[PDB]
Amino acid sequence: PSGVEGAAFQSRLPHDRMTSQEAACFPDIISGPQQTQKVFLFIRNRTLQLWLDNPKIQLTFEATLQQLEAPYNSDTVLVHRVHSYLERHGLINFGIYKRIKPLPTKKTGKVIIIGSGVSGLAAARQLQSFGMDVTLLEARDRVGGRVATFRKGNYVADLGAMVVTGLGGNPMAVVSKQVNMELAKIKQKCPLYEANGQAVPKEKDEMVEQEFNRLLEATSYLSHQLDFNVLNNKPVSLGQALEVVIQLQEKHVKDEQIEHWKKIVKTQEELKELLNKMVNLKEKIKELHQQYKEASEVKPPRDITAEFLVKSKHRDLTALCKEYDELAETQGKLEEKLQELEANPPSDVYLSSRDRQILDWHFANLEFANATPLSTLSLKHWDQDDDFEFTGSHLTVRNGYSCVPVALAEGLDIKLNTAVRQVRYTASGCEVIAVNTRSTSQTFIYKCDAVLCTLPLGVLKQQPPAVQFVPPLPEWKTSAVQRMGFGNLNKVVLCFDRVFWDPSVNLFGHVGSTTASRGELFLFWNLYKAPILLALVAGEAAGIMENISDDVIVGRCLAILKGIFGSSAVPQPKETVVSRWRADPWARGSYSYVAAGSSGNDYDLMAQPITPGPSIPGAPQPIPRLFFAGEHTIRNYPATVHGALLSGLREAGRIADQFLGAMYTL
Template sequence: MSSRSSSSPSRLQTKIRCATVTKNCSQVHLSDLLTGYDSMDILQWEDDDQALKNAAAQSRLPYDKVTTQEFACFPELHDSEATINLFLYIRNKILQLWHLESHIELTVEDVYEQLAPPYNSDSQFVRRIFAFLKRYGFINFGRFTRVKAPTERVKKRVIVIGAGAAGLAAARQLQYFGIEVLVLEARQRLGGRIFTYRKPPNIIVDQGAMIVMGSLGNPMITLAKQITTSFSIVEGNDCPIYDPCGRMIERRKDRLIERAFHRIEETALYISHTKNITKVSGHNLSLAEAYDVILNCRQLEHRQQKRREDFLEKFKGVLQDIKNLQDSMVMIKKTLKALHAKLEELQAEDRKGKSNDEKEKALRTIKIRCIMKDIRDSVKTYEEVDERRKEFEAALLELRKNEPSDVFMHDCDLHIMDFHFANLEYSMGTTLNNCSLKYYNQDDENELQGSHLSVKEGYGSLIEPLAENLPVHLGCIVESIKSTENGVEVRYSMKGVTDTVFADVCLCTVPLGVLKRSVAGESDAPQFDPPLPEEKQEAIKTLGFGNLNKVILVFDKVFWDSHHQLFGHVCDGNNSTRGEFYLFYAVHECPILIGMLAGAAADLSERLPSEMLVRQAMHILTNIFGSACPQEPVQSIVTKWKSDPYARGCYSYISPNGSGELYDLLAMPVKSASGKFRIFFAGEHTNRQFPSSVHGAFLSGLREAGRIADQLIGCPYSPFVPEIITLDDE
């Protein structure tokens, strides 16, 4: 009997055991890392809605809804709301029990004991729900301790090609189901695009995948609990950016430009999703084309800067003219006031007749006339000046009406904008002109929530243990996959010797980049006999496969600001160079920096000598940190994933002519002439919900293991009596 199937005292033991796992799992408690895991107690609140909601979320299932797959496997759910509610409670309860102790096999007997009446009244219904969750990898996956002794294996065999996350996940599940598996891996190591480099005493660095992308619902978190692996949170919010001269860019300016970048993103989404403008003259728009149009509109503002400077000069000139005229009018008023005073004085003297001297009277009359003339002239001048003032004020008003926008970007601002474009190209795995405007982010709604984490022991520490007790043959380069009426024949070479193995079905988990070479007829990739269906070949050709490279620099000690795990660098170049060392990642608690090469720079780096790339990275670091930066690293590693014959790149993306349906087409198994599925496919490029990720690859392996098992040994969750007695039947 499992330790699951017990009551309160055992729950306390479970709590202690989970706390121990959590403590081992990270310097920062795993409960602090996981959104939804405020504490492990949340999963222990018996029959509490929050505990069940959390369990469903950790399994990527809606707590209060039945999925399409569940409706297909349980047709009776269409009959009544009561049946749906019963199903959801039992399903969520089973998930809760699994997540409480995911390092120990959950049995259907455990579930019976934990289900309170009346939920346990229909034992067959409970068994079917349990079998469904087990078959499709929602429970009992990864590296857990078996409670039930394995029953005798069925006489079915599966060849798994590839020992990466997808291949090992599938092989382990199939073996658990009692099916014989054989894993063929071309490399002399496990992991595929997960490649952890280790060198004693403390150098651990990932050359491939290195980030656990989201913690809520991520099966990597379950693996970490099973294997007691350490995590650290990737703090990306505070990422300083340095200009080409090594000066830190003012944070305020960086934020302004980042906001402008997000406005461009939002505008592109509005154009493609709200207005549904995705084509021009029958041509599917790429992300770059849309961004260029939007950015060019903003660059028009940049070109208006000269106009604005001219405007300001004119504006200042008109203001000065108005001021001068107003000053003149003030002076004229003062003059008029003085003239009026003098005139009144002379006129008063004339009226009083102070002097009868005719000569003096004539002189006074002349003075009065002169003053009156001066007054008339001054009034005329005042009116003329006032008219000019009105004209200038009208001109000022017109200038204000035509005032150029005060929003613009200098060249240096555009280079900072390029940093954000490079970061988007990093997430896409390719240049923006290769990405579909409409579908590039089709999986965003499925993005896992919670912290992004790095694995202290390296990502390989999560995946490599899955190969324990599996028959994995390294160094086996598959040359051909042939489907027949009775099964499959896989020919491979090992150390120059060719051999052929036979099985009922084959699971192909080679990367999309290798499949592209296969359908192109390249001799360095596995060939399918007969060729894959035309629709599948077109999907392979159309779905994009990108590239991303790293320059890993090992030092004696940390010379950068250890408070920042990431810092950016702005390239003084163009679109093709903006991804050159645009970002440096500091490995947690190690004197190691990883320089990222994204977009066009990733492809360019494949053709450059590694020494040149290291020198370039060191030059940038010297500009930033000055004399604190050593002349050269203790050790360096340069990746070239596109040149890797067993990868041919990093991960998939949707090209302008593609859509999310391509992932579904690539996931579809291929039938033989007999009508039975013989060749199955897994990998991140077959997971529409979670593409371009390790967890997506892993989940695709669980998916195909379930699909293969359904075909080979029957469906234990079926409402009908299965044709084949399954391992769980008693």
């Protein structure tokens, strides 16, 4: 898409229609004459365009109106309203921009931000951008949270996020223009290699891959058409539904065979009933022939009864002889349907042991995508966020994705090595109690107007609590926290001094031995300028490899790589690193997933803020004080970096609208 209309697309916005968001801030416009609505949408798109075409400099309202032309620049307040709404909700002037007008020296309001993960920093920058006082509290000694980059010498390798999924409407696209990230396209070719060490043949790679995708479709059919979504009171998972689909295929494979051979019996028996006719007829023919021969032996001249007997037996013999002839056209009419059927047997198996093992690699890939055993994904909802898929190829950050948080953290008040231990929110404000991670006796008290929680969902899930809420979070929020899913996947970083793989291929697979070990080191990535290969541990493997010695794991990688490339070509690695994200107490997982019994609606609960009760009973209903951001809070873009960012942009807008007022609603 292109024009002002592409700016709306690039901002994840319908260009021809007003969002529920905009109806909220412009109830006059959206309830007014359709002409005004069209005027409004043009100013939105045009403004977005201006920002997008140059996102290194602030888009001031005056700069904006200058470029707008009549009749669109006739109503200065509609332009001011639009530009303000956009700026507030981070659709424009978000990220790292040069500020045309420097920030007011006098701040208003104090916000404490828990965690300097991307969602954290994104709100922090935005709130500071809006004239608020922000401090981020951070347990780690570095920013970025789950954006974690390895660096040593020239070696660079993301332990955390490492891919940008397409700039087609991706906010990272604006970020990349602002920050210099070396964005390198990922070539989608991926050769699998069985446990023996040798490539799957294209014939096989494709007939299994297509079965996988057909199998996925099948589950969607069970889900949406047959409403197979509950089973003995429990909710159905994607994994269960895949078994039931594979079974029903296996069941029909045998079903056809039974129908086939039961055709061969239906014919062997027509044959049998026909041979019996043919034998018994040869015996009537044997007897008549004897009889006619005996009657032709009576020498002539004979009486007429005796001449009748010859002529009669002769007609009678010829009658039976023509019957036995017609019956050997029919014996030779079934002796060949029989031969035909025997050469045309249906399929012997549904899938072979070697089929089902390459199918397991394609499942490992899903287990990777959703950081969890498919037995835990909701069948109905695991893919609820696929309409918002970005367009374009997938990319990697060749210079390490930490370059972005580090960029965002610039200019911000960040207390590192500061672990929050308790959150106190009252009708009159909030205080956050944190400790020094080095020495846990040094204790800190932070008073503030509002708290923004970007605590990972695994942290929030922890029993007993890593962080206490005073007062406790209401049940509607804690229930969503249980219900949701926080999964796990890990990485092994292999640092070599020779490039010994195919450089023109970015990623290649390893097919596992069992279904149980399908995710154990099933995929490798050649993403970096330097000689680094990167190995994935998905599915049920993820959680189990975490209790295994780093060296053993590196050993298995080497083995797998020996099998592929030969025991000679694979050196000892110079530097090795293994992630253990479920182990990390500042994460307790990698990202979230739509657990069975969960829905994308839980993601909305996760973001709804908390309002304390009144201090003095019978005093008016207070302001909300506890706000939530981070990957698990953004329904339409969970479990990603762009989604984290977006939730951070989101909470900064509502915190400002709460504590600074939204003047753009009149």
